[PDB]
Design the sequence.
């Protein structure tokens, strides 16, 4: 999808004059909508790798 | 103005001149006497504190040794790891030694360290080719590899060990090298057999045989009996003559 | 009742794995009293182990009761920082509970053979 | 903690022959079940039955050993070898150390009576 | 400055730049103090080790009381045959020190009586726990433990009182996670 | 002054052992935009690259070996050699100290009474595939016969050219005698 976004941006850059100030605003709402999904991806932390053998951080407690 | 091209040629600088060198004559063991009396007192405390286990103790030049039996290894190690005065937390080494003249030929040796008090201590047991030894991996995880070594080298079996297997010697090696019955060269050797196309193990044959030269050993006693350094507080009293 | 020996999270002191202990002195006092209890109950009075650990816990406990500052207590108890002192207390207590089951004060279980413990010193063997 | 490897058994010296009987039988069973793996992992030039024959021979070697401690030692050594073989630690040479017979006949004269040994100075 | 630098270039024994190139280097250098590291040919390894004059005057070095020819017997400076014995103490030899005492603090009867008293312990006549229970407070608190009653600690031969260096003397500044102990 | 319980004045912690505290984003004496610029323009990276470039303009250390050799010392230990006296007689007397102290047991000697009534060798071998080049053999000889040359250029295509015999050593000493005299004249006083 990010490749399809950046490839769909090609017509804008090659028609940028003829779509003066209208298609500008249109592509901004386009990019903002796509930035939303990027925001969802980051804050989920999808691309992060997760480790199983965790370092213990409990406390050492002795029953008396 | 100054530069490496105008740098001082130190090679010509005048050098110290000493006419006579004065080095006093001194024994290196007079340095140790007070520490030795201290180690004797500490060992005496430990023997009084664990009479069930400690058979004896020796001292020699800021080195202590405690003699025990295979049953007493885990308990004494717990004392030496957890007691306040003896926080011997680090495991420096494990070693076996072969004394075939004994019934129990092997003599396992633990060395220990206390970074807290800045001291080392030893701990000796005994074993046989069939009588095992308890493993202190329950306490010191670093003993894992050292006990695997002592097994592979001498054949001692460390009971309770999660994975006791050879570590140094070849994967199919049959024998325990550092035994005094094991010949230097071993029993086998390897070559490439062009026929089978495989590294193959064959009986040993050397093109120059081993020459020992331990037959030139001295016939005269080289270093006579030493010198007592026991503190007088640990010498068995002489009764007054009358 | 339960006690906190070692915080494995929080503010780090200069050692790794050890972290600042909130309210150490009460924990030290409870652990010292529990060690004295196990010794006074399960161990013989005439055993050197008991007397040694008793004087040790009593003296460390006095240094913990009279003093309030931890830096001072550390300069008096010559065993690391106070968060290491609590761990020494815990280890001593568990050793007491273990030694109550074993019987170190008893007489020798295995007596070595005469051939054992002879090392190249008998003047007539080599 | 330094954890044990795959097929590791903790060294435990049984006090009786009746338990070691069972442990030895489990070891023999594992060797047999794993013999095809010993044929795949090591590029072997003979049969799985011949491997099982050699295994039976190696267990018949010490069939008549009545001292308990020596039996415990033998069992521990055998479990070591099973761990060495099933995990692909050994290479082909260290494994075919156990199969001299399968390799081609070494020459012609293999003395078996006195006179040949004398002619070869092996008596 | 401190006792450990920084030091300029004209005291470092390296092959540097000369002329306008030095002005350019001191301009374009992160630290103009620094050296190229190539040694100075006239000095380094000159004269060559196989042509040192000092080898003709050289004589085997010595120390006075060991080179003395008259009152220098070997049996006084034989430190090998004076080696300290490996002492051994089994429970027998320790209970005698307990039931009896030592040459420094005797508690033994005179005559053949005390001799056989030693003999009773040389053999299994009295045990270590028996004489641990037969030991008065002055014995334990003064020969097993301390006079104060506390057990002895693992002795140190050469004690080390540590000290911390912070700030400017330290090897690294404050921010870094390493410190410096004297 | 002080009485200690399972402790000491050495094992008491250092005065300042307790590290102060980790600093947070607050209590940061460097504004957010400054460390942001260092974060986005890769400052320390450019600095390291410049320290790399300054080396690009400095003298390389390399030498051309076959035309320029590296430093060599009289104490150096390379190939072996058996020397002679100025008379032309060989120095070896078969004391067999070189055969005894040698760690690797490379040396192999066999002597007998020479026709002129003297003690001399008929066999002196060195397996340079057993040799570790320790120099204990040039140290034991009480006549300075066996030596170790600075030569290191004696590689071969076969392993049997390395089982040096007496003749191969006597010629090697006839060859390198001038170099051996330099090294001996500047090494003997210390040896
Ligand atoms: C097509 C291929 C042709 C390639 C051959 C080019 C030869 C050539 O043009 O010589 C120019 C010649 C190079 O100088 P050089 O004669 O070889 O330097 C010898 C000195 O002894 C140098 O004295 P030095 O050993 O102390 O080195 C000083 C050095 C020190 O350089 C630095 O420290 C500057 C650090 C690099 C800065 C990078 C900025 C880019 O500065 C330079 O040498 C010039 C570096 C530029 O003249 C110039 O300086 C022109 C610079 C352009
Ligand atoms: C001539 C060529 C010279 C350049 C060669 C560079 C070689 C490759 C550089 C490798 C990148 C450095 C790196 O290791 O990146 C990872 C690093 C991770 O840091 P992080 O996970 O985010 O932790 C945050 C808490 N500090 O995070 C970073 O360090 C990334 C830093 C940004 C990377 C460069 C961005 C360049 C674009 C500049 C845009 C400027 C506008 C943004 C606002 C700047 C405000 C001044
Ligand atoms: S220097 Fe070389 S030849 Fe001489 S003893 Fe050592 S290894 Fe052997
Ligand atoms: S030490 Fe010297 S003299 Fe003696 S055998 Fe060796 S080479 Fe010959």
Sequence:
């Amino acid at each position: 999808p990010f490749d399809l976004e950046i490839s769909t941006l090609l017509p804008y850059v090659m028609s940028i004059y003829l779509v003066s100030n209208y298609g500008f605003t249109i592509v901004l709402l386009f990019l903002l909508i796509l930035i939303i999904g990027f925001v969802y991806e980051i804050n989920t932390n999808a691309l992060k790798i997760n480790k199983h053998n965790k370092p213990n951080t409990d406390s050492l407690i002795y029953k008396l | 103005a100054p530069s490496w091209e105008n740098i001082k040629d130190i090679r010509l600088d005048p050098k110290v001149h000493v006419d006579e060198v004065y080095e006093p004559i001194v024994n290196p063991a007079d340095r140790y006497l007070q520490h030795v009396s201290d180690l004797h007192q500490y060992a005496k405390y430990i023997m009084a504190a664990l009479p069930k286990y400690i058979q004896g103790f020796s001292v020699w030049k800021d080195e202590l040794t405690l003699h025990v039996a295979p049953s007493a290894v885990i308990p004494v190690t717990t004392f030496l790891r957890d007691n306040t005065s003896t926080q011997y937390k680090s495991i420096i080494d494990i070693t076996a030694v072969d004394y075939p003249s004994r019934e129990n030929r092997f003599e396992v040796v633990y060395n220990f360290l206390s970074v807290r008090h800045n001291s080392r201590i030893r701990l000796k047991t005994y074993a046989t080719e069939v009588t095992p030894v308890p493993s202190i991996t329950c306490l010191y995880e670093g003993a894992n590899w050292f006990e695997r070594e002592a097994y592979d080298m001498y054949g001692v079996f460390f009971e309770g060990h999660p994975d006791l297997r050879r570590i140094m010697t070849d994967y199919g090696f049959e024998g325990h090298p550092l035994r005094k019955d094991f010949p230097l060269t071993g029993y086998t050797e390897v070559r490439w057999d062009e026929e089978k196309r495989r590294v193959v193990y064959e009986p040993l044959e050397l093109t120059q045989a081993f020459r020992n030269f331990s037959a030139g050993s001295t016939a005269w006693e080289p270093v006579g009996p030493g010198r007592d350094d026991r503190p007088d507080s640990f010498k068995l009293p002489t009764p007054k003559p009358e | 009742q339960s006690v906190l020996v070692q915080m494995r999270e929080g503010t780090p002191i200069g050692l790794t794995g050890i972290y600042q202990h909130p309210n150490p002195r009460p924990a030290l006092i409870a652990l010292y009293e529990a060690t004295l209890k196990e010794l006074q109950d399960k161990h013989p009075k005439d055993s050197v182990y008991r007397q040694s650990i008793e004087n040790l816990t009593a003296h460390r406990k006095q240094i913990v009761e009279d003093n309030e500052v931890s830096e001072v207590i550390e300069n008096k108890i010559g065993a690391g920082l106070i968060e290491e002192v609590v761990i020494q207390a815990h280890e001593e207590l568990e050793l007491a509970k273990k030694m109550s089951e074993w019987k170190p004060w008893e007489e020798l279980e295995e007596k070595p053979l005469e051939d054992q413990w002879v090392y190249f010193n008998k003047k007539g063997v080599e | 903690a330094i954890i044990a490897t795959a097929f590791a058994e903790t060294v435990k010296f049984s006090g009786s022959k009746q338990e070691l009987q069972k442990r030895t039988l489990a070891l023999y069973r594992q060797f047999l079940r794993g013999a095809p793996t010993f044929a795949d992992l090591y590029e072997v030039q003979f049969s799985i039955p011949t491997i099982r024959t050699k295994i039976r021979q190696e267990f018949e070697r010490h069939r008549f050993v009545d001292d308990l401690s020596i039996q415990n030692v033998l069992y521990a050594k055998g479990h070591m070898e099973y761990q060495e073989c099933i995990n692909f630690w050994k290479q082909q040479a260290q494994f075919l150390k156990y199969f001299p017979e399968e390799d081609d006949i070494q020459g012609r004269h293999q003395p078996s009576n006195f006179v040949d040994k004398f002619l070869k100075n092996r008596a | 400055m401190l006792p450990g630098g920084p030091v300029p270039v004209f005291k470092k024994y390296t092959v540097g730049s000369k002329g306008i190139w030095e002005k350019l280097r001191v301009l374009l250098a992160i630290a103009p103090n620094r050296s190229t590291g190539n040694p100075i040919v006239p000095l380094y390894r000159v004269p060559t080790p196989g042509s040192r004059p000092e080898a003709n005057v050289y004589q085997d070095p010595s120390s006075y009381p060991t080179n003395d020819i008259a009152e220098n017997p070997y049996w006084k400076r034989d430190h090998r045959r004076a080696y300290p014995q490996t002492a051994f103490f089994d429970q027998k030899t320790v209970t005698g020190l307990l039931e009896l005492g030592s040459e420094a603090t005797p508690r033994i009867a005179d005559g053949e009586a005390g001799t056989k008293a030693l003999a009773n312990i040389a053999n299994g006549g009295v045990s270590f726990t028996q004489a641990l229970g037969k030991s008065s407070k002055d014995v334990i608190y003064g020969e097993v433990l301390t006079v104060n009653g506390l057990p002895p600690v693992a002795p140190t031969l050469a004690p080390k009182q540590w000290k911390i260096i912070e700030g400017e003397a330290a090897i690294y500044p404050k921010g870094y996670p390493c410190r410096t102990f004297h | 002054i002080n009485i200690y319980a399972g402790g000491s004045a050495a094992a008491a912690p250092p005065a300042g052992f307790r590290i102060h505290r980790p600093a947070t984003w607050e209590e940061s004496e460097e504004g957010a935009l400054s460390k942001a610029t260092k974060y986005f323009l890769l400052a320390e990276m450019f600095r390291g690259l410049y320290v790399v470039l300054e080396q690009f303009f400095r003298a390389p250390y390399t030498i051309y070996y076959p035309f320029e050799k590296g430093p060599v010392s009289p104490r150096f230990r390379g190939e072996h050699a058996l020397r002679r006296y100025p008379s032309g007689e060989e120095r070896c007397i078969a004391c067999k100290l070189c055969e005894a102290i040698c760690p690797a047991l490379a040396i192999t000697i066999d002597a007998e009474e020479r026709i002129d009534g003297s003690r001399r060798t008929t066999k002196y071998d060195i397996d340079m595939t057993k040799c570790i080049y320790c120099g204990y053999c040039q140290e034991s000889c009480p006549v300075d016969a066996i030596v170790e040359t600075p030569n290191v250029e004696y590689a071969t295509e076969t392993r049997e050219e390395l089982l040096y015999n007496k003749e191969k050593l006597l010629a090697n000493g006839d060859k390198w005698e001038l170099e051996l005299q330099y090294a001996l004249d500047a090494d003997a006083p210390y040896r």
About this structure: Strands of chain C lie at 2-12. Residues 1-126 of chain C form one domain.
